[PDB]
């Protein structure tokens, strides 16, 4: 068995890799069940595709907080870092994609004097 945390926005999804069929359990619920009807649910199992696992590995995820998206990206990183423990050599390839990495873009209150707390109020052509 191997463990993989996984961070993103404000969600934490622990990943427990266990050699088996290929089914995963998201909060005592199947993958399709939890992430029911969501084109993004696929990106969650992307890291398992590169190194080609899934059909060889069974996972047990435990996420909490944030939204499905943040969870999807959370489980991802968790699975990626979890694959590292199984075989460090996987890093050389898995890393290439960019799964062994979280992400900022953490929502921030729209700063005043601006609009997106990021974009400043442009000026009408000089």
């Amino acid at each position: 068995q191997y463990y993989g945390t996984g961070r993103r926005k404000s969600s934490a999804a622990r990943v427990f890799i266990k050699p088996g069929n290929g089914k995963i359990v998201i909060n005592q619920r199947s993958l399709e069940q939890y992430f029911g009807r969501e084109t993004a649910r696929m990106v969650v199992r992307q890291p398992l595709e590169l190194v080609d696992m899934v059909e060889k590995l069974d996972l047990y995820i435990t996420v909490k907080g944030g939204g499905i998206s943040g969870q999807a990206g959370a489980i991802r990183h968790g699975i990626t870092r979890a694959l590292m423990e199984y075989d460090e050599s996987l890093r050389s390839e898995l890393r290439k994609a960019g799964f062994v990495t979280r992400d900022a873009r953490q929502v921030e209150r729209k700063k005043v004097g601006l609009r997106k707390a990021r974009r400043r109020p442009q000026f009408s052509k000089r």
């Binding site: 029911g36 009807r37 969501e38 084109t39």
Partner: protein, 137 residues
């Protein structure tokens, strides 16, 4: 099919993928019951009949604005075809959304309506200026 995976995004009238696709598949279901054809095939043909080929652009070439015909990229034809189908279905009168789509996808194959009028209008705009054709761009 990705096409349906995309059409379910626009027809996803207000990101409700949960029920959004509920009306989709329900439309293809009643489509096969109303028409003796596969829901898939009867779907693709609906988007093919709604795609422009040559778009005309304005150009104030020194003197005045000149309408010069230009070819359209296969990246915008998909978006437009998809967009004009959901708007047309939302123009019908039947009290069933799943039916407005099924009927729209059917009439789209039969060809006729506003969407077709625009196609002809643009087609008429072309050739009517086949002079600037040497400016194929």
């Amino acid at each position: 099919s990705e096409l349906l995976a995309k059409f379910v995004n626009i027809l996803m009238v207000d990101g409700k993928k949960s029920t959004a696709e509920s009306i989709v598949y329900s439309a293809l279901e009643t489509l096969a019951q109303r028409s003796g054809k596969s829901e898939l095939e009867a779907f693709e043909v609906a988007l093919e009949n709604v795609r422009p080929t040559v778009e005309v652009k304005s150009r104030r070439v020194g003197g005045s604005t000149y309408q010069v015909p230009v070819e359209v990229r296969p990246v915008r034809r998909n978006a437009l075809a998809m967009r004009w189908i959901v708007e047309a279905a939302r123009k019908r009168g039947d009290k069933s959304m799943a039916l407005r789509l099924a009927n729209e996808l059917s009439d789209a194959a039969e060809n006729k309506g506003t969407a077709v009028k625009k196609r002809e209008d643009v087609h008429r705009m072309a050739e009517a200026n086949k002079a600037f054709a040497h400016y194929r761009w």
